Amino acid sequence: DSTECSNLLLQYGSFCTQLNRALTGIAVEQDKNTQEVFAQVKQIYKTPPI
Amino acid sequence: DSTECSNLLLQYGSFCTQLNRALTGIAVEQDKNTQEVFAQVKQIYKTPPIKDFGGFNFSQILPDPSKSKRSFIEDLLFNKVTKFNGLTVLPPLLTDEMIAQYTSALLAGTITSGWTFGAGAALQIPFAMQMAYRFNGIGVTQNVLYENQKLIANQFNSAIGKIQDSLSSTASALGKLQDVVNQNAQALNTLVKQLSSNFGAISSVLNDILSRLDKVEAEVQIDRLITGRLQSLQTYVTQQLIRAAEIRASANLAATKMSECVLGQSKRVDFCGKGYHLMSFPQSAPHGVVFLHVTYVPAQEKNFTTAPAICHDGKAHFPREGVFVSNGTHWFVTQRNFYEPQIITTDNTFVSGNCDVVIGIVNNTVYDP
Amino acid sequence: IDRLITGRLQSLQTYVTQQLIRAAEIRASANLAATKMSECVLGQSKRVDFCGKGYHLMSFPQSAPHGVVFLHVTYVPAQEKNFTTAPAICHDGKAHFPR
Amino acid sequence: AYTNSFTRGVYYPDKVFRSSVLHSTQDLFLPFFSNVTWFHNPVLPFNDGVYFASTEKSNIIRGWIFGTTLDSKTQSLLIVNNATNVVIKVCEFQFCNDPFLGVNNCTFEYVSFKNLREFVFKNIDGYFKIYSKHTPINLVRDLPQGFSALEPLVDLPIGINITRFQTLLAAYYVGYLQPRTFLLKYNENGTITDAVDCALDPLSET
Amino acid sequence: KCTLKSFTVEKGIYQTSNFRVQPTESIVRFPNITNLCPFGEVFNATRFASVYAWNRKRISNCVADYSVLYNSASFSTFKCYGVSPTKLNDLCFTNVYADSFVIRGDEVRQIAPGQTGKIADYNYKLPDDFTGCVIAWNSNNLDSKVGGNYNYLFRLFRKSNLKPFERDISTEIYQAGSTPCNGVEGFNCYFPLQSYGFQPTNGVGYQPYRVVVLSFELLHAPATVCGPKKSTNLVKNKCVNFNFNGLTGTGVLTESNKKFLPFQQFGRDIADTTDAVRDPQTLEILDITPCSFGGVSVITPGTNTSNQVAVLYQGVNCTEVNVFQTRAGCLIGAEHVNNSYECDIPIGAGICASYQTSQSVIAYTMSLGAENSVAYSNNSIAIPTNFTISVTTEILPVSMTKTSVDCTMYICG
Ligand SMILES: *[C@@H]1O[C@H](CO)[C@@H](O)[C@H](O)[C@H]1NC(C)=O
């Protein structure tokens, strides 16, 4: 949160967008991975009482 | 153009060759990925002149000669999906017409010969008899096809027609291919915008530095641009090497689906779509493949009383290839995937010793032919 | 010296990154070779073109430097003849199907 | 008295042709739907730059004065429409604006309700910029809806510092420019059409 | 061989170089030559400035050409200090000035950096590091008069020396004793001016020379003066280096069908690369295409097979470079062949090359396999009668060399 550094970091262009975009793609994959493993069942089947 | 920059860039040595070696390794791999998927047929099995396939109607997925000679659905797929600063884009080895000749050969061989063209020479089989083998392969007896053949054929024609023409109504189905187009375009635009960036230099325009500054200081400002532009170009080829590894995984999966679905019949659950798999047809799409998996799904939910075995002359009988079921008053044996009751005979069944051992055995009669 | 440190460090980061990406491709090939050992050598695969082109009978592993060779043995049908065929035959007014 | 600015005053940010494209820029602009002052003749602060717009039928507005003092001690800018022409000059002037027809320590000179005029005035020591547009309207006292794009008239060589301004003499409105990010819809003819004020609301930011 | 660092090459296609179409000429374009600076008033007047009270012009808001002053035969001497007279036509300034006076032929030499004596110390003072040029010309026909032209005067006496660039017009009576002069001549009290007494008969050291001194300032307010701008003819459909209004680039210039607005000067593509310009000398909008470039690839059988090769210019048209225009680029030294075969060496877009029959590199459209019609009918089946047992070799990478690097031993060692 230094304003003096922040104005220099703008002179590096797209790099900081390109990293935060890469981590967002990795974040969304973790939900996809979990959905593809567990959500294979169409209905919440449940066991008889006895 | 700048010989000043070109001479400064020599101090970094081999990096300029490493990045082009890495991009060449990726570029050679598109052509391998498409040959592993499509080029797994030895001969071009044409298409027969007379369309006597029982009731089954492949005209939506067979070639259209009025057009590349794509099928109808294969032309919907292309329509729903469909540079300068030292950057160049290279053509694929197989053209879209050569890939459409391969999907044509694969489904023409499948329709006329079954799985036989995968194991050796294509052997002709009437299409209704190929479908009876594929029913027999999912544990449903052949006569369940021949006795229902017009129903099965109408129900296939409805599913491959009415429902699959949903691709005319919506483009959002092809999101996996559109994503691969968008990611490569957005990476390549990000590589170009990085030329406008200063990286701490007095200007991002290379001739502007050389026109404004004394030669010893101009070399400091240019080395600032070289450092940032080289890091930008390394970031791009690193992300393309990582992205090409997921495309290789998808191409190895698609090549495996082309062998095990399509030119086989897979017993692997949920591999070739939901339900008990019968067939699949490949259709080409830009940068990808589409499999139309044909599959058998059962349809009832009321009940029968059942037993593991039945007693007769003090001996326990077990069903030879089926289940024992009662309609409430009478006992039958059925095949297990489709309700077709049969009288319990000594050749519907096999004995295994005494009545006393089995838990839940029932007393009934076994008929002797 | 800091110019040499900066350049040689970046040279070594570029090597290690491409080595990590290349090791992932060798791991995918070793996971495939362990699956071919299990399903082709320790079993008989009913899985089309997994254990060579043809109907798979069996397979044998041989060592190679940094790899494995599988010698896949397969039945390949040959010398076919054309016949007339029928889905069923009709006898005493009843339809018979081949067992 | 106050009035709402709506979505007006989108001057072309640079002399570049662009087409079928959505360009992003960070210039000094009217923030959308902001309040502006309404008038129908005070000396006013200039801030970071001015938007001015007026109900054109009678042509009663004659020009403007800009500078720091506007009244001796240092050079100040006069711009006036002398009927067929416009006179631009930057002397150490010292006058009231009300006697407009009556108006050396000087270094430059140059000569150039039925409607809305729209004009924008901007400076950065790197020469003094005027943009404008004109459009027909209904007989309404305040700014109408829709987008308006303002075209660069002149970029005058003056080098004068400005903190204050005044007008020579319809309704007229005064708003101020602010550092703002905009997304601009250049159509197939390379005219700016629609625009998004990226800091207005979360949907615009999206 | 040099690309591969080897004396042996295996069969393949190798990218060995990149080639680019070079610019055939340089184009420069600027607006019509207009608002040329008003220097002539300082030289061509009937009157002239008198050195005891010299006159300055201001030059601003205009384009100069100082090279007129060092090419015209109208002047007897030209001198310059600090910066070259040619460099003045490259430079730019917030204001420019021209000082003027008449001096006798023996005393024009006082107008130089760091000088001393009557003219230098009491009439016109230049510092030791002055930047500017001085123009002097004999004016005995204009400025001399019978008995002397007493309008031309120099200050002989002053209270103190001038500072550098100090202008003074003072005419106060000089005092040379304790007696107060009360603003008039008298005992030890004298008029501070003298005349060269310019007469038409005078020898050259006593003849009038008109003189002008150029001077400049560049300030935080941007330059209102610059030197002259070049321009060239306009050439199209050829690769050229170009400079429109200071915008440098290299490309092919063409006609366009774009509709620029009257204030717009150049047009941009989606990635903020220029793709069109207005010619400042017409209403023509010109489209810009970058000059044709691509990889050069060498197509070879093995070096123990043949030294013959073909060359592919990737994405380049054969117009720009026995010859064959593929979709992948111009191919040279390969024979096009109307047959088709398995793909031996891949080129792209369905094209491959091989070494074949008297032998050469050939290029052909690749064959996907033999065409076959399966003998399908609704009652025909084919059944195998034999089974040829087949052994196939599958080979897989399983591991890699266990290399390790100490980064401190590699970096420093
Ligand atoms: C096959 O289906 C198409 C519609 O998709 C229809 O036009 C055609 O007549 C059908 N073919 C036959 C032999 O009935």
Ligand SMILES: *[C@@H]1O[C@H](CO)[C@@H](O)[C@H](O)[C@H]1NC(C)=O
């Ligand atoms: C048959 O199974 C259904 C499954 O939903 C169940 O609701 C029903 O109770 C069963 N029938 C009888 C007679 O219990």
Ligand SMILES: *[C@@H]1O[C@H](CO)[C@@H](O)[C@H](O)[C@H]1NC(C)=O
């Ligand atoms: C059970 O099957 C037999 C033979 O089809 C039929 O006669 C009998 O009525 C059935 N019983 C019930 C409860 O439906």
Ligand SMILES: *[C@@H]1O[C@H](CO)[C@@H](O)[C@H](O)[C@H]1NC(C)=O
């Ligand atoms: C089945 O369940 C019923 C009710 O729980 C019970 O009466 C019967 O004895 C059970 N039979 C077997 C074979 O488990």
Ligand SMILES: *[C@@H]1O[C@H](CO)[C@@H](O)[C@H](O)[C@H]1NC(C)=O
């Ligand atoms: C089954 O039949 C036998 C006689 O064959 C009898 O002894 C036995 O009790 C019967 N069991 C049931 C559950 O009815």
Ligand SMILES: *[C@@H]1O[C@H](CO)[C@@H](O)[C@H](O)[C@H]1NC(C)=O
């Ligand atoms: C008869 O069988 C052979 C088997 O190779 C096949 O080539 C041929 O096409 C068949 N005959 C006809 C008339 O199709």
Ligand SMILES: *[C@@H]1O[C@H](CO)[C@@H](O)[C@H](O)[C@H]1NC(C)=O
């Ligand atoms: C663009 O320019 C053409 C020709 O001047 C004109 O016909 C068209 O209406 C303009 N607008 C659009 C949106 O194309």
Ligand SMILES: *[C@@H]1O[C@H](CO)[C@@H](O)[C@H](O)[C@H]1NC(C)=O
């Ligand atoms: C050497 O020649 C043989 C036969 O022409 C060829 O197979 C091989 O690829 C060649 N190798 C090299 C390195 O030239």
Ligand SMILES: *[C@@H]1O[C@H](CO)[C@@H](O)[C@H](O)[C@H]1NC(C)=O
């Ligand atoms: C090659 O360039 C010439 C001249 O521009 C043109 O006539 C020709 O059609 C071009 N050919 C291809 C395939 O681009």
Ligand SMILES: *[C@@H]1O[C@H](CO)[C@@H](O)[C@H](O)[C@H]1NC(C)=O
């Ligand atoms: C290829 O065949 C066409 C047939 O019209 C002919 O014109 C052409 O000259 C042939 N090419 C060569 C290189 O012989």
Ligand SMILES: *[C@@H]1O[C@H](CO)[C@@H](O)[C@H](O)[C@H]1NC(C)=O
């Ligand atoms: C089967 O093929 C072998 C050669 O592979 C041949 O020797 C043998 O005679 C053939 N048998 C028949 C019955 O055709």
